[PDB]
Structure formats: structure tokens, C-alpha cells
Amino acid sequence: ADVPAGVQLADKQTLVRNNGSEVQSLDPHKIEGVPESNVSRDLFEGLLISDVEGHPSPGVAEKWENKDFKVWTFHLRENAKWSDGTPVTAHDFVYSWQRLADPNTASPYASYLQYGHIANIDDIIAGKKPATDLGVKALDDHTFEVTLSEPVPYFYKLLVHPSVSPVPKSAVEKFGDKWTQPANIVTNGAYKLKNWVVNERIVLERNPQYWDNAKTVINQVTYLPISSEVTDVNRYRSGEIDMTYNNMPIELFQKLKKEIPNEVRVDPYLCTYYYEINNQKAPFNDVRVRTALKLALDRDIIVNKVKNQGDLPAYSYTPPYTDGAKLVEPEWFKWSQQKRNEEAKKLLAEAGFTADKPLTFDLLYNTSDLHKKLAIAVASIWKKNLGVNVNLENQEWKTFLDTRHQGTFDVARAGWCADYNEPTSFLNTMLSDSSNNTAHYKSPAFDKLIADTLKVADDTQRSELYAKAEQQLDKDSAIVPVYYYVNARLVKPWVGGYTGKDPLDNIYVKNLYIIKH
């Protein structure tokens, strides 16, 4: 943290943050969500980190160079250490990125290395080459060199993600899946794990071996797993929670904006809320049905009337304000809702649905006040505008993610937040073989449009190709875009160092501080 001149700090430097739900894991190679990455950034630090405003900045690597955007060399600071005191080395990153790539690890983010195009990744994922062939090598203890199969000008932007953070080989090998217990874990970020009580709390304590430890101010942070946004707001207002999670409840938000204006932080956020359709399950493998659902949902009612927290009605998957996005707004979005509704009823009648045999399916969502109120409003809107019946089902976060990967579903509530600020951070997730593709969408046309993007060395040509990729997705109605999020949460007046300028919301508790109050 960089504490402004003249601010007076509290004696006690502890922080309580709500984290949305129980993390899937603390293993950087087994995680894929916001809750999971919130905690991962305090414990594991990769090559680069985001600074307080979100810019890619020195992490373990103090400086780096590239040759033709294909060979990237990272110079690792000499005093980077793990919490047990041993040095963080380039060999740590070699082993880690090989473990990420290895199909035996089954990482949900194994495709992150395809997105950066590291050499040999495709064969590695397919089991044709061992993970030791991955295009990474430690030139020495403080030098990590990455070789890509094609130029990737924005490659270094990928490197703040938890999936490319280092893991400690010796703890992993000795303890297997219990390497992350508090008695066994070893960490290299600003914090260390103190306690982990499932469905109760995660407590982190300063890591004195962290290379930037002298600038760390908060000595302890607890992460809570409260999925009820109403409860999170209540425990914030009672004094227990210093920072809510960034999902706000429909029950209380309008009241909050008028009662505590200064605590309600509302900032840009590169995340899209949508209903993910399982594209390989009938009748959702029929474009007419996916299109009807997309068109009959009334975004103005949901975004401006039922939620009304600043979100913007969505017509695409990649948010239009992503760096590099120049999207074409489709004609259906400018129509009236009436005109969308006829076309949608038309398409279902054409798909063979009638009043006597209507379209009935499940709408799965992760337990949450917000998602349940949005799902009920969407069910009612779909019933009224299209005559479809929906059976709502909630599941806890971890289970919800497994279901989506299994494909044991019809439609699911969904949100994707960028990992790096470039359109391929969204678009790559719809690639046929993407480990992140829970829409189970497979389009040879979509895949080729994206493959073409690194075969041109022109930003305009690249942006036009992303725009066409979004058009292919929309044409196929892969998903139901609902709104582009705003980052809305409550933050106590004494929590300093949260700017709201990072559109990725990559917060590091080592950058925060408690003001005397």
C-alpha cells in the first residue's frame, strides 16, 4: 500500500471482506471463479500483478522483454521468496506452467496456455506430448523464458491470472490434495493462510518473507463465504464486514444509495451477465429455440426496472468497452420488445412448440438473492412473452460450476469477467476446445475467425475480426446476453486504497489500509 501523506492509520490493521461463496479450492490450477481468484491474489504471485488501478506491473518478474512478441524473457527479482523462506525461482514457474498444461491435473484453466499460444500446448493437452515439452524454460534461477507459436502483442497482460501463478512442487508432491491445508501450504504472495473453516471463514496473515512486505499494511484479512447479498449488506452495516462482495441485493440497493451514498462504490467492470444455454442438448441445439429465448427476454425490464443498479442492457458477450472492442450492435436490439416477442413466438411455433406441448426447461443458478430474484423475473417474462415454462434450481457455487462443465443442464445463469483487458479474454472461451466453454458451443466458423486474429498484425483488422466473431455468436444465439455489469459494492469509509479504477477488480489486500476511526 502507498499510504497518503497525512492519513492517520488505525492501530489495528485487519480487514473483513465478503467473498460470495466457499472457494472451490486454494490450488491455483484447480480454480476458475472470482471468489477463488480474490483469495488467490493475496496468496500466490505470478510474473506480473495488477497495480491499484489495474495496469499490468512487476510481480515476481521485475522486468521483461520480448522478441517479435513471440519469445518473452522475464527477469525475476532476486529477493522473491515463499513463506518458508526459500527463493521463488524460474524453475518454480517452469514446473507450475507444466502442471497447468498436464491433462492429469485436469485444470479448468488448462486452455489459458492456448490463449497465450505457448509452444506445444495443444499436443500437451491432447496427450500426444508430455508436459515437459511446453515452451517454457528457466535460463537460470532468476530468468524465465516463454516461447509462443505466433506473435501475441498483449501476451504479458495474461500473466496476472491465478492460473499462471507458481505453486510449490515440494508441498504438492508430498501432500497431494491436502497441500493447501494451513499446516502444509507454502505461499509467495503478501499473505499466508492462517485458518480455513469451510463455509465459515478463510483467515490470511501477513507473509513476512514477501519481497514487498515493507509496504504491506493490513496484517490480517478474513474472507467470508456469504452468498446472500442481503446478509452481506446486513453484516457490513452491523460493523462485522468492511467490504461486501460485489453482487448487490435488489431488496436493499435503492435504500443504500440514499442512506450511505459515500459507501456505495459503483465502477466500470468488464463482466457480462447472461443466460448460458447448453448448446449440445436438445432442444437447445436448435438455433430457433435459442434465438427465441434471447429475443423474448426483456432487458429494459430486467436491467432498468427490476435491478436498476447502473448495469447496461447487453447485446453481445464481450463488453463493448473492453480495450479493442468495436462491436456492431445487432438490429434486433434496437427493435421494440413487441417486435422481438413476435419473432420469438414465431420461431418456437416453427420449432414445433404449441400451447398443448409448450417449451419447459430448467433454469439453474448459484444460490444468491440477486440471481434468484433475477431468475424469477426472467421466468415470468419468458412465461408472459413467450409461453415457456421454467423450473428454477439453485446449487451452491462449487456444485453449480461442476454441473455446467458436466453439461447436466438446460439453461444456467452465468457471468464472465475478463482475465485480461482484450476481447479474446472473452472470445477464447467460446472456442470449440476451450476448457472454459461451458456453453458447450462448437463452431468451426467462430473458431477460424479467432484463429485469424493473430495471423494479421493489424489492430483494426483484429478488431473487425472480433466484431465478426461476436456477430457469429449472435447469429447462432449461443447465449442470452442480459447486461454488462457495473462493479457495485459497499466499502467502509475507513478502508483506503480501493480506487475502483481497475475494470478487472483485481484487488490485492497488500494495497489496502485502515484509516483511524
**Is 369 among the residues that bind U ion (CB under 5 A)?**
yes
Instruction: Please choose, out of 48-56, 170-178, 254-262, 368-376, the segment that lies near U ion by the rule CB under 5 A.
Output: 368-376
Residue 367 CB, shortest distance to U ion, in Å, is: 11
Complete DSSP assignment for 67-109: ETTTEEEEEE-TT-B-TTSPBP-HHHHHHHHHHHH-TTT--TT
Residue found under cell 505453486: 167
**Residue number with CB closer to U ion (410 or 464):** 410
**Is 362 among the residues that bind U ion (CB under 5 A)?**
yes
Strand partners, 221: 15, 204
Are the beta carbons of 430 and 424 closer than 8 angstroms?
no
> Residue with CB nearest U ion?
11
Residue 320 CB, shortest distance to U ion, in Å, is: 15
**Is 123 among the residues that bind U ion (CB under 5 A)?**
no
Residue 258 CB, shortest distance to U ion, in Å, is: 20
* Near U ion in 406-465, by CB under 5 A: 410
**Residue number with CB closer to U ion (111 or 227):** 227
**Residue number with CB closer to U ion (102 or 369):** 369
**Is 65 among the residues that bind U ion (CB under 5 A)?**
no
Supply φ then ψ for residue 259, to 5 degrees.
-80, -40
The three-state (H, E, C) secondary structure of 13-51, written as one string: CEEEEECCCCCCCCCCCCCCCHHHHHHHHHHCCCCEEEC
187-196 per-residue burial string, b: 16 or more CB within 10 A, e: under 16: bbbbbbbeeb
Residue 31 CB, shortest distance to U ion, in Å, is: 27
- Given 133, 267, 286, 323, the residue binding U ion (CB under 5 A): 323
Residue 11 CB, shortest distance to U ion, in Å, is: 4
**Residue number with CB closer to U ion (153 or 500):** 153
Residue found under cell 524454460: 137
Distance separating alpha carbons of residues 3 and 294, to the nearest angstrom:
48
Are the beta carbons of 379 and 352 closer than 8 angstroms?
no
Q: Is cis: bond before 330, omega within 30 of 0? A: no
**Residue number with CB closer to U ion (284 or 315):** 284
**Residue number with CB closer to U ion (216 or 278):** 278
Residue 137 CB, shortest distance to U ion, in Å, is: 26
**Is 68 among the residues that bind U ion (CB under 5 A)?**
no
**Residue number with CB closer to U ion (149 or 463):** 463
For 176, the 3-state DSSP assignment is helix
* Near U ion in 383-412, by CB under 5 A: 410
Strand partners, 18: 224
Q: Which residues bind U ion (CB under 5 A)?
A: 11, 153, 323, 362, 369, 410
